[PDB]
DNA sequence: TGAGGTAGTAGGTGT
DNA sequence: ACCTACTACCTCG
């Protein structure tokens, strides 16, 4: 039923009339970098349309300045247009007010002494120390304006790892080379390629032209935007960029959620008394607990790994093949036993084959693969020592082009490493097309499909989709080959159309209703063609955007933090807390936006949350994302890693990419 | 390549 | 303002 939660935000005082009335100042430039203008001007000023809004009186601005861009040196002329009223109810204007709030926060953060400040992040406490380093604790902050015209503070605890000696001093105590390194004078970062026994003056002079320190040896360095282009530097003016890997052999960085909540409140009070905008009042929200998904193997299960003993939801006659690259022979006995018990419990036929070929055999290897595929082999288990990334990708692509999905399982391998080999097996079986689990129950949409553009800003460079359809039949869709830039709407519609075609092949008809799930980056209009095409077909739909970041945090007011929390926010938007584990820090709720359709938010949250328990290749922990998006994510990744273009030998129920 | 999420480092649309 | 990559950590609905 109902529960109440805290968000990690805090209400502060309403804006006063002076703040609701920013100083307007239009700008003239010959012939975008309006932000640069706002910065050069100084004070609390942001872009407003093609002009500037500021909460600072003109007495402190630098109107006449010299903006120095990176392409064209432009002319800085700003002119006072009086004061302009903004309505917090109006999105654009409220966005202006919020940008002003943000600038305010940044300015007052900058005027603090004794703390490490990085943008809108402050780090006050010391949490752990070197040996040449320290870890500070603090929070990432944000400050904006509500619809009701009041300040809103966001706070989220975070640690920062800082080196306090030079690269020279760091390497002088024995430590290895960090993969990255930052200037001592500014925030710029480089990729440390190597060291150089070259002399300084035979380069040094360049830095000589610009302190209270001494320089060391030569460092080969690189700009991220050109990784193959080496450029010389001085170890004295360099500071290592330290990661967890650099401090591996020396710091507990995950917070129990009660502790995160505590630090959130305290840091909020602290910045609160630095801000002078009132007493931060934590905002509360009504949350709803969603019903628990009923996962089904042959019988009820609590996790997909249980299907290995209870039996699969839907099994068929299966042939699997073993490829060994460690020098030994035959199926390890406990693997055979587990597979046989699983298929036994499912009442299905199992055949275990052994591939007698080695990738070193070139065309003979491909031929033996083709022959295994002819004899009915659906997937291959590769027992191998840890492969180099390049070799992994080569071997996988090679098996795939002959129509054989592959599951890698690393040796040495012991029967007691049950989680590892059981997950390998679940992956193998999904790759063979088996349906290991499904949801039992009624859902409004009988087809749910997730779209992924590789995190990119558009589908114009392609993408992929995966779907769950009607029990839990899982399938993947790639776009057919053009390797060029396409019209994004047509890529999206083509992925969906192919998914509909598979559904129709299986059911003798189109679905009555589909649930379309997408990421948070591409513009919503990239889906317009697909939506209209569903409408022309009389198919109903909902489009829901699912954002992995930006959901903030959610805490219970009282009692324990539990999964399956649905938290409605502003009008078509809600938070969904899908997964949580106490040993796993604090959850990051998904932020979802209902973009099209008329299904109530509650029923959408219910289905999406339930799709989260469907992933067949994780035996013991549920994914945060609903399975179609999680799947699509992994699919685009593997398409990128293997170079796949015209897959034709692989059934769409074979989840080769998990 | 077991997998999950979270946690850290950095990134994207001169030397 | 949303996205990505890498590593570490701990644990196994
Ligand atoms: Mg896998």
Give, in order, the Cα–Cα distances in Å from A391 to each of A191, A326, A385, A641.
26, 14, 12, 11
| Cα first-last separation, chain A | 35
How many Cβ atoms are within 10 Å of A14's Cβ, its own excluded? 16
How many Cβ atoms are within 10 Å of A297's Cβ, its own excluded? 26
Question: Same structural domain for residues A301 and A430?
Answer: yes
Q: Give A285's strand partners.
A: A5
CB A296 within 8 A of CB A439: yes
What DSSP element (H or E) covers A291?
none
- Written as six digits, the tokens of A108 are 């007052």
CB A631 within 8 A of CB A658: yes
A274: Cβ contacts below 8 Å, ≥ 6 apart = A108, A112
CB A465 within 8 A of CB A453: no
Residue A538 is given by DSSP the state T
Please tell me the distance from the alpha carbon of residue A562 to that of residue A564, in angstroms, as a whole number: 7
DSSP strand pairing (A318-324 vs A350-354): parallel
Alpha-carbon radius of gyration of chain A: 29
Question: Same structural domain for residues A74 and A129?
Answer: no
Question: Same structural domain for residues A351 and A429?
Answer: yes
CB A545 within 8 A of CB A592: yes
Pick the closest to residue A629 from A430, A462, A447, A450 (CA basis).
A450
- Residues A30/A33/A37/A43 CA torsion (nearest 10 deg): 170
Experimental method of this PDB entry: X-ray
- Written as six digits, the tokens of A104 are 């305010």
- Residue A109: φ, ψ to 5°: -70, -40
CATH number at residue A115: 3.30.530.60
Question: Same structural domain for residues A55 and A138?
Answer: no
Q: A412 preceded by cis ω (within 30°)?
A: yes
CB A164 within 8 A of CB A247: no
Please tell me the distance from the alpha carbon of residue A12 to that of residue A469, in angstroms, as a whole number: 47
**Domain finish residue from A520, A536, A557:** A557
Please tell me the distance from the alpha carbon of residue A94 to that of residue A87, in angstroms, as a whole number: 7
d(CA A419, ligand 1 centre) in Å: 13
Question: Same structural domain for residues A469 and A487?
Answer: yes
Question: Same structural domain for residues A250 and A305?
Answer: no
Please tell me the distance from the alpha carbon of residue A110 to that of residue A96, in angstroms, as a whole number: 21
- Written as six digits, the tokens of A78 are 């700003």
Provide, for chain A, the percentages of residues in helix, strand and coil under a 3-state DSSP scheme, each rounded to the nearest 5: 30, 30, 45
* Cα angle A29, A33, A35; round to 5: 115
Question: Which positions on chain C have an atom < 7 Å from some protein CB?
Answer: 1-13
Please tell me the distance from the alpha carbon of residue A571 to that of residue A563, in angstroms, as a whole number: 23
DSSP strand pairing (A116-118 vs A77-83): unpaired
Q: Give A477's strand partners.
A: A465
**Domain finish residue from A557, A577, A610:** A557
Q: What sign results for the dihedral spanned by CA atoms A37, A42, A48, A52?
A: negative
CB A481 within 8 A of CB A645: yes
A221: Cβ contacts below 8 Å, ≥ 6 apart = A181, A190, A191, A192, A193, A230, A231, A232, A233, A238
- Written as six digits, the tokens of A159 are 């640690």
Question: Same structural domain for residues A255 and A359?
Answer: no
Please tell me the distance from the alpha carbon of residue A24 to that of residue A53, in angstroms, as a whole number: 5
CB A456 within 8 A of CB A469: no
Q: Which residue is nearest to nucleotide C2 (CA to C1')?
A: A521
CATH number at residue A318: 3.40.50.2300
Question: Same structural domain for residues A260 and A377?
Answer: no
**Of residues 376 to 395 in chain A, which lie within 7 A of strand B by their beta carbon?**
384, 386-389, 392
Q: What sign results for the dihedral spanned by CA atoms A513, A517, A523, A526?
A: negative
Question: Same structural domain for residues A52 and A93?
Answer: no
Residue-number span of the structural domain to which A512 is assigned: 290-293+441-552+558-658
CB A545 within 8 A of CB A524: yes
CA of A158, C1' of B2: distance in angstroms? 29
Tell whether A633 is in a known binding site: yes
CB A613 within 8 A of CB A564: no
A432: Cβ contacts below 8 Å, ≥ 6 apart = A318, A320, A378, A379, A405, A654
Q: What sign results for the dihedral spanned by CA atoms A422, A427, A431, A434?
A: positive
Q: What sign results for the dihedral spanned by CA atoms A169, A170, A176, A178?
A: negative
CB A238 within 8 A of CB A167: yes
* Cα angle A588, A592, A593; round to 5: 155
Tell whether A87 is in a known binding site: no
Question: Same structural domain for residues A159 and A170?
Answer: no
CB A600 within 8 A of CB A434: no
Question: Same structural domain for residues A179 and A325?
Answer: no
Nearest nt to A457, CA vs C1'? B13
The region, left, alpha or beta by phi > 0 then psi within -120 to 50, assigned to residue A421 is alpha
- Written as six digits, the tokens of A256 are 């129990």
**Of residues 107 to 166 in chain A, which lie within 7 A of strand B by their beta carbon?**
157-161
**Resolution for this PDB entry, in angstroms:** 2.2
CATH number at residue A30: 3.30.70.2620
Question: Same structural domain for residues A315 and A356?
Answer: yes
How many distinct structural domains can be found in chain A?
5
DSSP strand pairing (A150-163 vs A133-145): antiparallel
Pick the closest to residue A107 from A159, A156, A145, A55 (CA basis).
A55
For A450-460, give one letter per residue: b (16+ CB within 10 A) or e: bbbbbeeebbb
CB A207 within 8 A of CB A143: no
Alpha helices in A510-577 (DSSP H): 528-536
Give, in order, the Cα–Cα distances in Å from A181 to each of A186, A207, A614.
12, 17, 43
Find the helix packing angle between A627-642 and A389-401, rounded to 10°: 100
**Domain finish residue from A51, A69, A84:** A84
Find the helix packing angle between A488-507 and A528-536, rounded to 10°: 40
- Residues near ion ligand 1 (Cβ under 5 Å): A 427, 658
The region, left, alpha or beta by phi > 0 then psi within -120 to 50, assigned to residue A151 is beta
- Residue A15: φ, ψ to 5°: -70, 140
Residue owning tokens 């109006």: A90
Residue owning tokens 């440390």: A192
Query: Within a 13 Å sphere around the CA of A62, how many CA atoms are in the beta-carbon half?
Result: 13
CB A151 within 8 A of CB A102: no
Pick the closest to residue A434 from A340, A335, A311, A295 (CA basis).
A311
- Residue A371: φ, ψ to 5°: -65, -40
**Of residues 239 to 258 in chain A, which lie within 7 A of strand B by their beta carbon?**
241-244, 253-255
């Amino acid at each position: 039923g109902k529960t109440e939660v805290f968000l990690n935000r805090f209400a502060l005082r309403p804006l006063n009339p002076e703040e609701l009335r920013p100083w307007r100042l239009e700008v003239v430039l010959d012939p975008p970098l309006l932000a640069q203008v706002a910065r050069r001007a100084g004070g609390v000023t942001v872009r407003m349309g093609d002009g500037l809004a500021s909460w600072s009186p003109p007495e402190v601005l630098v109107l006449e300045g010299t903006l120095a861009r990176m392409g064209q040196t432009y002319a800085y002329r700003l002119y006072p247009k009086g004061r302009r009223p903004l309505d917090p109810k109006d999105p654009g204007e409220r966005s202006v007010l919020s940008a002003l709030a943000r600038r305010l926060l940044q300015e007052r953060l900058r005027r603090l002494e004794g703390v490490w400040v990085e943008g809108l992040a402050v780090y006050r406490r010391e949490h752990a120390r070197g040996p040449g380093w320290r870890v500070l604790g603090g929070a990432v902050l944000d400050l904006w304006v509500s619809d009701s015209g009041a300040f809103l503070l966001e706070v989220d605890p975070a640690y920062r790892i800082l080196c306090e000696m030079s690269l020279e001093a760091w390497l002088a105590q024995g430590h290895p080379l960090p993969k990255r390194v930052r200037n001592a004078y500014d925030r710029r970062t480089w990729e440390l390629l190597r060291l150089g026994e070259e002399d300084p003056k035979e380069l040094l002079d360049y830095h000589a032209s610009k302190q209270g320190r001494e320089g060391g040896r030569v460092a080969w360095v690189a700009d991220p935007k050109d990784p193959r282009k080496p450029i010389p530097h001085l170890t004295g003016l360099l500071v290592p960029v330290l990661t967890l890997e650099d401090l591996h052999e020396e710091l507990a960085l995950s917070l129990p959620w009660e502790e995160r909540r505590r630090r959130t409140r305290e840091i909020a009070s602290w910045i609160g008394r630095r801000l002078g905008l009132g007493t931060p009042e934590a905002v509360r929200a009504q949350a709803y607990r969603l019903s628990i998904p009923k996962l089904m193997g042959r019988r009820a299960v609590s996790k997909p790994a249980d299907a290995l003993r209870v039996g699969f939801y839907r099994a068929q006659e299966t042939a699997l093949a073993l490829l060994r690259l460690d020098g030994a022979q035959g199926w390890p006995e406990f693997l055979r036993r587990a597979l046989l018990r699983a298929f036994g419990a499912s009442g299905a036929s199992l055949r275990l084959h052994t591939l007698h070929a080695h990738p070193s055999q070139g065309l003979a290897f491909r031929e033996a693969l083709r022959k295994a595929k002819e004899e009915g082999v659906q997937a291959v288990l590769v027992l191998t020592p840890p492969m180099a990334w390049e070799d992994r990708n080569r071997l996988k692509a090679l098996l795939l082009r002959e129509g054989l999905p592959s599951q890698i399982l690393n040796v040495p391998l012991r029967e007691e490493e049950r989680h590892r080999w059981e997950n390998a097996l679940l992956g193998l079986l999904a790759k063979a097309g088996l349906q290991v689990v499904a949801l039992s129950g009624a859902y409004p949409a009988e087809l749910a499909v997730g779209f992924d553009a590789g995190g990119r800003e558009s589908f114009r460079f392609g993408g992929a989709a995966c779907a769950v359809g009607g029990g839990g039949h899982l399938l993947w869709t790639l776009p057919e080959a053009q390797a060029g830039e396409r019209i994004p709407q047509e890529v999206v519609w083509d992925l969906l159309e192919e998914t509909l075609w598979a559904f129709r092949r299986k059911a003798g008809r189109l679905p009555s209703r589909v649930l379309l799930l997408r990421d948070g980056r591409v513009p919503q209009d990239e889906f317009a063609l697909a939506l209209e095409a569903l409408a022309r077909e009389g198919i109903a739909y909902d489009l829901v955007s699912v954002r992995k970041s930006g959901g903030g945090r959610v805490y219970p007011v009282q009692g324990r933090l539990a999964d399956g929390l649905y938290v409605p926010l502003e009008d078509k938007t809600f938070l969904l807390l899908t997964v949580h584990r106490d040993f796993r820090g604090t959850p990051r709720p998904l932020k979802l936006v209902h973009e099209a359709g008329d299904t109530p938010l509650e029923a959408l949250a219910h289905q999406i949350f339930h799709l989260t328990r469907l992933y067949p290749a994780s035996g013991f922990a549920f994914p945060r994302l609903p399975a179609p998006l999680h799947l699509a994510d992994r699919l685009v990744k593997e398409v990128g890693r293997l170079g796949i273009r015209h897959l034709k030998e692989v059934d769409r129920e074979k989840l080769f990419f998990v």
